[PDB]
């Protein structure tokens, strides 16, 4: 019986990070943290931190806890209000060619390729999920906290008033907060090299 600690952790998770978790995951999680730190009787402050760290490493797809409202993909245009602690599955810069990007990433030198005798703000396109519905997040205004090297499974808070169109959220810096974390299962498949290689038609992916 860890249901007393679960309510206190649930209160804190929502209050501090607007993180919503199912009761069964939360109870299973507390029990594991108690087994891991068997020798001690942890404080609620330490428990809340360790629960949140486990959440940051959890695949929301495996959590089965809807956050984003129903039929958000069914509406052609609208506005979204409220706090959502979602997960980035994959991320790419659409302001730059993927071939140009993969070349730089692969560290190969293409200096002689742009030699001739004759004398652009970034836009990241985020693949966001609550674990049930998958939508897109666009860098409408420069959001410097986001970068292409963020690990797949990175948890981010999407809040405030956000205008959406054709399954794309028009995110401004005042609407984004990076929580951290990663998903091992996603690190493999949606690594920046693999994301870009797919956009230039490279096989075995």
């Amino acid at each position: 019986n860890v249901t007393s600690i679960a309510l206190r952790a649930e209160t804190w998770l929502l209050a501090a990070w607007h993180v919503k978790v199912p009761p069964m995951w939360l109870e299973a999680c507390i029990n594991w943290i108690q087994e891991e730190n068997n020798n001690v009787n942890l404080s609620q402050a330490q428990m809340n931190k360790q629960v949140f760290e486990q959440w940051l490493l959890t695949d929301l797809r495996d959590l089965e806890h809807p956050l984003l409202p129903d039929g958000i993909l069914e509406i052609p245009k609208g506005e979204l209000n409220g706090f959502y602690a979602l997960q980035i599955n994959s991320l790419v810069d659409v302001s730059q060619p993927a071939y140009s990007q993969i070349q730089k990433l692969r560290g190969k030198n293409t200096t002689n390729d742009l030699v001739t005798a004759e004398a652009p703000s970034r836009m990241l396109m985020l693949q966001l999920t609550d674990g049930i519905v998958q939508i897109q997040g666009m860098e409408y205004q420069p959001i410097p906290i986001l970068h292409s090297d963020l690990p797949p499974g990175t948890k981010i808070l999407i809040y405030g008033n956000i205008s959406f169109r054709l399954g794309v959220l028009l995110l401004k810096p005042e609407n984004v907060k990076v929580l951290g974390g990663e998903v091992d299962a996603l690190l493999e498949e949606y690594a920046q090299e693999k994301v870009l290689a797919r956009l230039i038609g490279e096989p075995d992916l």
Binding site: V94, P97, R165, L199
Partner: protein
């Protein structure tokens, strides 16, 4: 060294033997020093005449016996024993004894120099003032010193064949530079050893592997021609590998009485249809454009920088469509005839000694550029745009004398050199740049404008283009309806195949082809059929050219890279400055290339495998 030292040295000199690089240089220099009073005489070579004339050298009245050679008097090769391909293993050519000899066709010239040395008390070298010219000078010294070992040897230094230059050369004779001659002997030796060893190795091997394809064909190797080919194959491969991508952009245009204004998206373009579609949909609903910022600042177009060999070779190809080999041939002809300064120089700084005001004045009789030349003089005088390089030997290539008697390409290159010189000595074009930023549904678009106020150097230099792009009047705060709001598609474009000027640029960047030798190496890969010119006219590699580069590059060591030749050429510059001796450079370069050779012989089957991709099976 001093005037008293020279006068003392000259005492008792009656006949002075003078030797030029070619007969036309000898006829020209003799005509100017003698004031046409020279007396022609015949040498043992029908094409290399003797021009006798009385002259006064360092307070001594002498008879100047002005003759010439026909370029390099001596040929370098291995001994007879190693000369036959089947007489030795190509690897021994890295140590095989090398000798200098006079070819049968030049023996008449060698015998004329020897003949005249007997009647002459001093020798003055009048070969062109470059590395090859100093080496030719030392070939003339060796031949004459064989007759008279105590012969007084002097060197005339000049950058043009004009009465003042050749007269000053006589008042400022110097000692012949053995250091620059030695750097030529080192390059000549390395080119023979690396050239012979690698050529014999691949030609004999590939003739055995592909008999039907490469029968009696010569697969040559050059330490510089190989990285030159490498650039052409590297660019072709870049294009072959390039993946084009579809992009989308919002195009907003606004129609005006005498022209459509196109506002360019500040986001430029997006490689995602949904990302652009969403932003475009926002623009169709509320397309009312508001003038955010109407900014304007002075813009200027810079006049050309003082001309050096590389810029001449590149601009003659791009602007005049004359290839570097021809440009250098015409440029040498105009130099010899006295119309331009020595066209083999790295200098882009006009020396303080040089009177630019006279050189400009000299061009005022011309119907086309005469008025402009006068204009420079009226506006205070010449104000050249100098660079940062100086060889400390020659000034930038410039017109030394006015002529209107030139024809064909000779006229085209002279006209180019004159216009560039005047443009350089002129002012920069001055204009006014304007920009109008508009907002459509929080999306920013920008239209640009240009208004040239003073064309300046552009009035003499038509090879550069600047054009007015006059924008209509937009007030900061205005609101308007755009003509069209579109969502157009584009694609990324690959690089293009290299042009000659593009190839020279890459060679320059990587430090190969130095001492104005770019053309020679580009011509060799053209002639050996390793590269071919497209109708565009860009460099396309052939199957043998392609196969050799990817054959050696598959061996591990990146041989198509120009790093090893750049190091070789760097060492040659050190020999000239006396910063390194010729024996260490030779030992080091030979050890370096012998190693690369030994690794290539070990992995020789890689060459067969790379070419098999094109010629198929073969044993």
């Amino acid at each position: 060294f001093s005037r008293a030292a020279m006068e003392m040295a000259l005492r008792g000199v009656r006949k002075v033997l003078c030797v030029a690089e070619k007969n036309d240089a000898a006829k020209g220099i003799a005509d100017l020093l003698s004031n046409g009073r020279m007396r022609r005489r015949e040498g043992l070579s029908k094409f290399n005449k003797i021009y006798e004339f009385d002259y006064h050298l360092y307070g001594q009245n002498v008879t100047m016996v002005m003759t010439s050679v026909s370029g390099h008097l001596l040929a370098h090769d291995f001994q007879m024993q190693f000369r036959k391909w089947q007489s030795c293993n190509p690897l021994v050519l890295f140590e095989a004894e090398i000798e200098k000899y006079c070819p049968e066709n030049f023996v008449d010239i060698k015998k004329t120099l020897e003949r005249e040395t007997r009647q002459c008390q001093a020798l003055v070298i009048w070969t062109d003032c470059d590395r090859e010219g100093e080496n030719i000078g030392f070939e003339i010294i060796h031949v004459c010193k064989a007759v008279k070992p105590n012969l007084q040897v002097l060197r005339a230094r000049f950058s043009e064949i004009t009465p003042h230059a050749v007269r000053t050369a006589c008042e400022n004779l110097t000692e012949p530079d053995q250091r620059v001659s030695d750097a030529v002997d080192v390059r000549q030796e390395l080119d023979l050893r690396i050239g012979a060893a690698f050529t014999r190795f691949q030609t004999l091997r590939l003739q055995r592997i592909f008999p039907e394809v490469l029968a009696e064909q010569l697969i040559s190797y050059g330490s510089c021609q190989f990285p030159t080919l490498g650039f052409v194959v590297e660019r072709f491969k870049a294009i072959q590998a390039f993946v084009p991508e579809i992009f989308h952009r919002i195009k907003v245009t606004h129609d005006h009485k005498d022209g459509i204004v196109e506002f360019n998206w500040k986001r430029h373009r997006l490689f995602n249809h949904t990302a652009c579609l969403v932003l475009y949909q926002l623009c169709v609903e509320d397309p009312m454009a508001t003038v955010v910022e109407v900014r304007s600042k002075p813009k200027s177009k810079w006049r050309p920088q003082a001309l050096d060999t590389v810029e001449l070779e590149k601009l003659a190809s791009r602007k005049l469509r004359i290839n570097a080999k021809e440009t250098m041939r015409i440029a040498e002809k105009l130099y010899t005839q006295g119309y331009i300064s020595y066209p083999r120089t790295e200098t882009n700084i006009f020396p303080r000694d040089l009177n630019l005001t006279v050189l400009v004045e000299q061009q005022t009789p011309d119907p086309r550029w005469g008025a402009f030349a006068q204009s420079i003089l009226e506006r205070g005088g010449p104000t050249p745009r100098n660079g940062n390089k100086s060889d400390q030997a020659h000034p930038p290539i410039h017109p030394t004398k006015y002529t209107n008697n030139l024809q064909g390409d000779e006229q085209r290159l002279y006209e180019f050199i004159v216009r560039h010189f005047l443009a350089c000595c002129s002012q920069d074009a001055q204009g006014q740049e304007t920009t109008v930023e508009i907002d459509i549904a929080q999306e920013r678009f920008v239209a640009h404008g240009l208004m040239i106020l003073a064309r300046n150097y552009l009035d003499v230099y038509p090879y550069d283009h600047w054009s007015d792009k006059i924008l209509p009047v937009y007030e900061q705060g205005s609101h308007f309806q755009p003509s069209t709001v579109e969502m157009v598609d584009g694609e990324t474009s690959p690089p293009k195949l290299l042009t000659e000027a593009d190839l020279i640029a890459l060679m320059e960047k990587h430090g190969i082809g130095t001492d104005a030798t770019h053309a020679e190496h580009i011509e060799t890969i053209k002639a050996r059929m390793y590269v071919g010119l497209t109708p565009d006219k860009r460099f396309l590699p052939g199957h043998l050219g392609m196969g050799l580069v990817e054959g050696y590059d598959s061996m591990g060591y990146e041989m198509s890279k120009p790093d090893l030749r750049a190091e070789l050429e760097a060492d040659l510059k050190l020999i000239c400055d006396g910063k390194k001796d010729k024996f260490v450079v030779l030992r080091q370069q030979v050890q370096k290339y012998k190693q690369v050779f030994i690794e290539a012989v070990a992995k020789a089957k890689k060459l067969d495998e790379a070419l098999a991709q094109y010629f198929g099976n073969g044993t």
